[PDB]
Structure formats: structure tokens, C-alpha cells
């Protein structure tokens, strides 16, 4: 994973006024019986962004978006999708 890891950019389909994904994901895990994940807040100046890294068990994912909880929003949203993993 030193080679780039997991790396994707997309919005949930049709998001609520306070629909929250990174609480959802935590909140999957205890329901399936998992750990909890924990993240950090960057931003690059090249595309002057705010990006959330999650990191889990034995897996870690990147989510370069607008502000902070749109930031957090696509990280946790993002491992969610390779949590499926099908």
C-alpha cells in the first residue's frame, strides 16, 4: 500500500440535510462487531482542498474534498465501500 493507497472522489447519492456518513461507519462497526476508526484533517494547497485520511484495522483510505466535513464525509464514505468489499 506504499504504492497509493485506496484513493477515490464522489458524493453519496442524494445526501440529506444531516445525513452523516463517518458516524454511520462507526456506528457499522460496533453493529458488525468491529474497531473504531480514526482520522486526520489536511489540505493541499495544490488544489487548495480539505482532505480526511480513515484509517481501520489493517486498512487505510484518502478523501481529497471541500471543507472539513465534506473532508470526513468521502473518507468514511470511502472505506465504507471497500468494507463491502462486494
Known amino acids: 500500500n506504499d504504492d497509493s493507497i485506496p484513493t477515490s472522489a464522489e458524493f453519496p447519492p442524494g445526501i440529506s440535510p444531516t445525513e452523516n456518513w463517518v458516524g454511520k461507519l462507526q ?20 488544489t487548495e482542498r480539505f482532505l480526511v485520511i480513515c484509517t481501520m484495522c489493517n486498512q487505510k483510505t484518502r478523501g481529497i474534498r471541500s471543507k472539513k466535513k465534506d473532508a470526513k464525509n ?10 463491502e468489499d462486494g
Not at 453493529?31 to 482520522?39: D, F, M, R, T, V
Not at 468521502?74 to 468494507?83: G, H
Open 74 to 83: 468521502l473518507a468514511a464514505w470511502l472505506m465504507w465501500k471497500a468494507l
Open 27 to 46: 456506528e457499522k462497526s460496533q453493529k458488525s462487531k468491529l474497531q473504531a476508526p480514526i482520522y486526520e484533517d489536511s489540505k493541499n494547497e495544490r
